[PDB]
């Protein structure tokens, strides 16, 4: 019944025998182009020229505290070609016969039942089986601008590292998470044509994988309230580093435009009501004269916060500077005129 599947795989106006022969010609022409791999390139970017893979077949350490390829329970190596034109054998390897068995199990075991179809339809089956059983592996020759390259410090020097993905590990993760209860992320964004042009067969079979979710705990997500409350405001100008501050005594009148500009440009659009407003406590004021070396408030001088408390000011030591009895009124009137 394989002849019906072969005829269905061809969509043309030619008769039955020519529709059969096109499949055989395509197979006989495209055996040599295809290869087998586990870490093929062109998965992170379809524009990478050529075919680059690794085909790592090693032992499972099972004692190291990490995960890689030939360390998980993957069983099927990936089949990848260089061009989507030579993709016919990658669909030929996934064909269903009478009962529930793929053509691999009849292929490397030399089952005669499959041999009936491939010896009655045509006579090239032995060479095709020889070509597809022992199959050329990858050597990751050359690199392009699309493969990610990074620098890693090795001792006193640096090493250039070229990163390649893992198709088989991705497929295994996809199915294992499919039959599980882990949160997971689907991540369906790959088109069918892009998956076809990637060149492999696992991505064609599974274009939308299943991905581990690696996120911080649930109470760390940004939401409306966390951005809404935020925190109080402090000036970017430190009193001790300015000229004419007299350790807490403004003298020069040229600082007044700077003070009112710093008050206006920082408190703009940050009004909050008295319910959300900060409280001007007494120990924060007193600690200022304690640190600066004063026992009591100087005569003719008052405490004025550079950032207004009505516009989200902070009740911290770094928020006010003492000013003259007149300049306090001037700053207050200017701020009242600007806001209200």
């Amino acid at each position: 019944m394989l002849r019906n599947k072969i005829l269905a795989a061809i969509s043309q106006k030619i008769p039955e025998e020519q529709k059969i022969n096109k499949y055989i010609e395509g197979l006989f022409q495209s055996i040599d182009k295809n290869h087998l791999a586990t870490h093929v390139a062109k998965f992170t970017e379809t524009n990478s020229p050529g075919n680059i893979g690794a085909y790592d077949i090693l032992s499972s350490d099972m004692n190291c505290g990490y995960l890689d390829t030939a360390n998980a329970g993957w069983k099927e190596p990936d089949i990848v070609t260089n061009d989507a034109k030579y993709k016919r054998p990658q669909g030929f390897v996934a064909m269903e016969m009478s009962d529930g068995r793929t053509v691999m199990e009849h292929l490397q075991e030399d089952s005669a039942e499959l041999r009936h179809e491939m010896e009655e339809l045509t006579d090239k089956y032995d060479e095709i089986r020889d070509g597809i059983l022992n199959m050329p592996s990858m050597q990751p020759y050359r690199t392009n601008q699309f493969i990610k390259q990074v620098f890693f410090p090795v001792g006193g020097s640096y090493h250039l590292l070229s990163i390649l993905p893992s198709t088989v590990l991705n497929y295994e993760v996809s199915d294992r998470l499919y039959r599980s209860k882990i949160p997971k992320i689907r991540l369906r964004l790959l088109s069918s044509n892009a998956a076809s042009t990637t060149g492999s067969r696992l991505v064609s079979k599974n274009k939308w994988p299943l991905v581990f979710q690696a996120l911080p705990p649930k109470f760390l997500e940004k939401n409306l309230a966390k951005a809404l409350d935020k925190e109080y405001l402090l000036p970017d100008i430190n009193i001790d580093e300015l000229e004419g501050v007299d350790n807490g005594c403004l003298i020069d009148e040229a600082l007044l435009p700077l003070i009112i500009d710093e008050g206006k440009r920082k408190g703009e659009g940050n009004y909050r009501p008295r319910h959300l407003r900060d409280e001007r406590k007494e120990e924060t004021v007193q600690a200022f004269l304690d640190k600066y070396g004063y026992c009591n408030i100087p005569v003719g001088y008052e405490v004025h916060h550079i950032v207004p408390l009505s516009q989200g000011g902070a009740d911290s030591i770094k928020n006010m500077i003492m000013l003259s009895i007149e300049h306090h009124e001037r700053v207050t009137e200017a701020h009242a005129s600007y806001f209200k």
């Binding site: 524009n47 990478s48 020229p49 050529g50 050359r142 392009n144 601008q145 699309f146 369906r188 964004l189 940004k222 939401n223 409306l224 966390k226 951005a227 809404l228 970017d236 500009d261 710093e262 206006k264 440009r265 703009e268 659009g269 009004y271 516009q311 600007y338 806001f339 209200k340």
Partner: protein, 324 residues
């Protein structure tokens, strides 16, 4: 020198953050602001799309349930507020990868010749002009009553603008604030500084309970094709690449400019996603222009140098054609 290096890669010299949307009243725009939220919406429409005659005669009068999202003002505010920021980085230090060495030396020498010749003032003026006329509002600019834009650099507050008076087609090179800001931008592009930080706040008056248009996200899902709007920490906003596209719409030097007469953004081939036809197909593309600038070392008119520097400001992957 024969060709471009196998691995050449720059960065973006004008980084922009994601905008945020706030609503307030115009008379009290300098005091308080309120959050703007995005609501869901369901509609029942008809089959208005074009159909083949059999499908049309079958489904002519069927209902159509659809899902969408919408953002709108309240009944007590009539002003939308947008706050964001820009970071400017030097061009010479913006190159991230160059496999060849002589090509890097030639690039540095040509950039030195350009800064000694002009000094990045023209592109800075054009960028601050695209800032001043509020081109980044996109669909929010239509139907506006008053558009006010202010610019803050470090700790100095520049006088406010008025984007309504500015034309969206010409360019102004005599505004004092424009030249003052463009001087700092050209200095930061030059390399005299090390970075620049600009803070932009825009007020637009559209009326009470009107509609705003935040960025629409690109998503793929099963059994859900509705419109999804960009939420930024709960509030609405705009994508960084949406704002960056509006800023770099300064290219008025493409062929047949005197016919169409509108500026376009700067791409490698001069292609904008509103005409469907590239304005610089083969003979004015960036690749051959930078080939003739570097490999042949042939001098070019100042317009081509402006276009090449504008491409270099945006950044990309200007490597040679890769081989297998």
């Amino acid at each position: 020198l024969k060709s471009r290096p196998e691995n050449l890669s720059f960065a973006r010299c004008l980084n922009t953050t994601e905008a945020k949307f706030w609503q307030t009243d115009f008379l009290k725009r300098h005091t308080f602001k309120l959050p703007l939220l995005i609501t869901d919406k369901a509609v029942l429409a008809s089959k208005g799309h074009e159909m083949p005659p059999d499908k049309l005669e079958k489904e002519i009068m069927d209902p159509n349930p659809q899902k969408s999202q919408s953002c709108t003002l309240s009944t007590e505010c009539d002003t939308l507020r947008i706050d964001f920021g820009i970071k400017v980085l030097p061009v010479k230090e913006s190159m991230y990868s160059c496999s060849d060495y002589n090509y890097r030396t030639a690039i540095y020498q040509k950039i030195d010749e350009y800064i000694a010749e002009d000094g990045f003032l023209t592109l800075a003026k054009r960028y601050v002009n695209n800032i001043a006329n509020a081109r980044f509002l996109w669909r929010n600019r239509k139907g506006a009553e008053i558009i006010e834009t202010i610019v803050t650099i470090e700790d100095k507050e520049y006088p406010s603008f008025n984007s309504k008076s500015f034309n969206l087609d010409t360019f102004v090179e005599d505004n004092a604030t424009i030249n003052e800001i463009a001087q700092q931008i050209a200095d930061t592009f030059a390399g005299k500084r090390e970075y620049l930080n600009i803070y932009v706040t825009c007020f637009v008056k559209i009326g009470c309970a009107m509609e705003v248009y935040p960025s629409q996200e690109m998503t793929f899902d099963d059994d859900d094709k509705g419109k999804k709007l960009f939420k930024f920490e709960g509030s609405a906003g705009m994508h960084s690449q949406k704002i960056n596209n509006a800023l770099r719409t300064i290219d008025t030097w493409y062929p047949d400019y005197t016919t169409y007469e509108f500026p376009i953004p700067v791409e490698n081939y001069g292609a904008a996603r509103s005409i469907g036809i590239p304005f610089r197909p083969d003979t004015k593309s960036f690749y051959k222009l930078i080939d003739r600038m570097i490999l042949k070392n042939e001098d070019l008119p100042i317009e081509d140098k402006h276009y090449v520097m504008a491409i270099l400001i945006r950044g990309g992957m200007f490597s040679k054609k890769q081989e297998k």
